């Protein structure tokens, strides 16, 4: 058996073909086993509508998840990515740096 805790990166992107749209991204990478729970949060609350959830694996069996959806941030609102995995004794909350 092997277990590997995920790396978590939270950031925003605009698609080059539709610059006016902004996306909140949580990239959860290099994890094993594949069982996982991933949520985007707005002001501490789970975002129910996340339109894109792209999973893949590498040659050694590690998993990669890109979880993202369109959003319109404002200064007042805080966003985060919350991950639960067997390697974590408590849920991991990674806050979105509004400059990222």
C-alpha positions in Angstrom: 0.0 0.0 0.0 0.9 3.6 -0.4 -0.7 6.9 0.7 0.2 10.4 -0.4 -1.4 13.6 0.8 -2.6 16.0 -1.8 -0.9 19.3 -2.7 -3.6 22.1 -2.9 -3.3 25.2 -5.0 -6.2 27.8 -5.3 -6.1 30.5 -8.0 -8.2 32.3 -10.6 -8.0 32.3 -14.4 -9.8 33.9 -17.3 -10.2 31.8 -20.4 -8.3 33.5 -23.3 -11.3 33.0 -25.6 -13.7 34.7 -23.1 -11.7 37.2 -21.1 -14.8 38.7 -19.4 -15.4 35.4 -17.5 -13.3 34.6 -14.3 -12.9 31.1 -12.8 -12.1 30.0 -9.3 -9.8 26.9 -9.4 -8.7 24.4 -6.9 -6.0 22.0 -8.1 -5.5 19.0 -5.9 -2.5 17.0 -7.0 -0.5 13.9 -6.4 -2.8 12.1 -4.0 -3.3 8.4 -3.2 -5.6 6.7 -2.5 -8.1 8.4 -4.9 -11.0 8.6 -2.3 -11.4 12.4 -1.7 -13.8 15.2 -0.9 -13.2 18.6 -2.5 -15.4 21.8 -2.1 -15.1 25.4 -3.1 -16.4 27.8 -0.3 -17.7 31.4 -0.3 -17.7 33.1 3.1 -17.3 29.7 4.8 -20.3 28.1 2.9 -20.1 25.3 0.4 -20.6 26.3 -3.2 -23.2 23.9 -4.6 -22.7 24.6 -8.3 -19.2 23.7 -9.4 -19.4 23.1 -13.2 -16.0 21.5 -13.9 -14.3 18.5 -12.1 -11.5 17.0 -14.1 -9.8 13.9 -12.8 -6.7 12.1 -14.1 -4.0 9.7 -13.0 -0.2 9.3 -13.6 1.9 6.2 -14.4 2.5 5.5 -10.7 -1.2 5.7 -9.8 -1.3 9.2 -8.2 -4.4 11.2 -8.9 -4.9 14.8 -10.0 -8.1 16.9 -9.7 -8.9 20.3 -11.2 -12.1 21.6 -9.6 -13.3 24.9 -11.0 -16.3 27.2 -11.8 -17.1 30.6 -13.0 -17.3 33.3 -10.3 -17.4 37.1 -9.7 -15.3 38.0 -6.7 -15.6 41.2 -4.7 -13.4 42.6 -1.9 -16.0 41.7 0.8 -16.2 38.0 -0.2 -13.7 35.4 0.9 -13.2 32.1 -1.0 -11.4 28.9 -0.2 -10.9 25.2 -1.1 -11.7 22.5 1.5 -10.2 19.1 1.1 -10.8 15.9 3.1 -8.6 12.8 2.5 -7.5 9.7 4.6 -4.0 11.4 5.0 -5.6 14.4 6.8 -6.7 14.2 10.5 -8.8 17.3 9.9 -10.2 18.9 6.8 -7.7 21.2 5.1 -8.9 24.7 4.2 -6.8 26.6 1.7 -7.8 30.3 1.4 -7.8 32.0 -2.0 -5.3 34.8 -2.2 -7.3 37.4 -4.0 -4.2 38.4 -6.0 -3.8 34.9 -7.3 
